[PDB]
Amino acid sequence: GNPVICMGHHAVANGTMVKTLADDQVEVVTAQELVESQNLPELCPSPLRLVDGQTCDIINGALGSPGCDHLNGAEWDVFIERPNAVDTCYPFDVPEYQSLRSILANNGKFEFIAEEFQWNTVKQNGKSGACKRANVNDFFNRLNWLVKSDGNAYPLQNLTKINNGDYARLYIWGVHHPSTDTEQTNLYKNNPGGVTVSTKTSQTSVVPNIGSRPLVRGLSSRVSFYWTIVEPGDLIVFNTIGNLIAPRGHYKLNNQKKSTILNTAIPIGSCVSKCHTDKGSLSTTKPFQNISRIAVGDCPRYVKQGSLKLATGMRNIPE
């Protein structure tokens, strides 16, 4: 009596090293990489809606700077802001810049509603050579530059916009900063000027600053931009004795704000992906990625490791 039967398992010539709790290098027959380390050299325009700012960043888009007209009516899941975006208008600053940029980005649309402001004797539509539009002196197309009458009057301004619609409104308004008191006086007569924007629940007051400032786009003067959100049932009051860069209306806010912004130079292609990094879209089923902590959409989780191998087979012991 001597037939023999043996029970055994498969093997291959060269398997894959994996880690366990116990051992850092164990050879198994097959394994699968869980960290995505390759990205597409482009951003996928589907199935998320990407809006390419091109030359305008999102703040300049909102203000209506020249070159930003392609952003009118734009709706996005992800606003693509370009590193080489260029200023094309009056030198300006925004005191809570990142906060405004967040609101605009999160909101997800540029839907502007023109409104009629009955500014008193003051003259409207001040323009500049710092803000040329089609080689003609111009300004932010969402803003209205008010100055004294020809008969040197800047009467205290005071008009009111009432929100009785079914959506919160965003008003963007500014304050002008002359480089001289002469400059101040030839513009607004009054010195100092001043703005107070009020709602039922808030009032915001700005006193203009006059000083020598670096030449930006051939100017030493500046505009500072502010914003006011007016919920339905509330309203907004504008008050000026000089220096107001007035709104021409309001942007619409969504009730639910679900969008965001991505700053990257990566071109938009023709691929399909729901995961976007600042280095390009990912096309993967892996649960992790080491490409960038900056990631928007339906993405793998960002980790530090370059590789994590999951065993998908038994230990490899050949011969």
Partner: protein, 172 residues
């Protein structure tokens, strides 16, 4: 492996076994053969693709977050933003490292387990007609032609058929 089969009492795997993870290798009077075991193979495969699927596709659908790159320091607020992100990344990297280590330790034990189950199943079919040689092989103490071998492989082997022949060979 907790069971000591793979890289244990089975000294190595079979590169010639290419149509299954586990199988049988026999030698009788008419020759030798190697055949895959479907049920043990499928059990191991089912338990592994199961892990794969629980892993691949969960939900990290994120839009508006926080800024994560900064040109110049600003102080307190920026420090917090960077600290939150760095904290978040270390925790997830830890989770990923531990997950893969646990899963792999489990996968190796499972595959070692299925090997042992297959061995134990065959042992039970063979009753008193065979003896463990210690290397994952049974010495069969009766003539066992190809049909006989196949009956052990498909689970129709009837030990009573050969018992008298086998007992006599083992003990005299």
């Amino acid at each position: 492996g907790l069971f000591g089969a793979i890289a244990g009492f089975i000294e190595n795997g079979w590169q010639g076994l290419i149509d299954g993870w586990y199988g049988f290798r026999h030698q009788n009077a008419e020759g030798t053969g190697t055949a895959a075991d479907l049920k043990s193979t499928q059990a191991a495969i089912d338990q592994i693709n199961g892990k794969l699927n629980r892993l691949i596709e969960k939900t990290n659908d994120k839009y508006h977050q926080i800024e994560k790159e900064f040109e110049q320091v600003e102080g307190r607020i920026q420090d917090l933003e960077k600290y939150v992100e760095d904290t978040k990344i270390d925790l997830w990297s830890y989770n990923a490292e531990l997950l893969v280590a646990l899963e792999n330790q489990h996968t190796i034990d499972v595959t070692d387990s299925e090997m042992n189950k297959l061995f134990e199943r065959v042992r039970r079919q063979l009753r008193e007609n065979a003896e463990d040689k210690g290397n994952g092989c049974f010495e069969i103490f009766h003539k066992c032609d190809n049909n006989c071998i196949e009956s052990i492989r498909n689970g129709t082997y009837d030990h009573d058929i050969y018992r008298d022949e086998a007992i006599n060979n083992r003990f005299q």
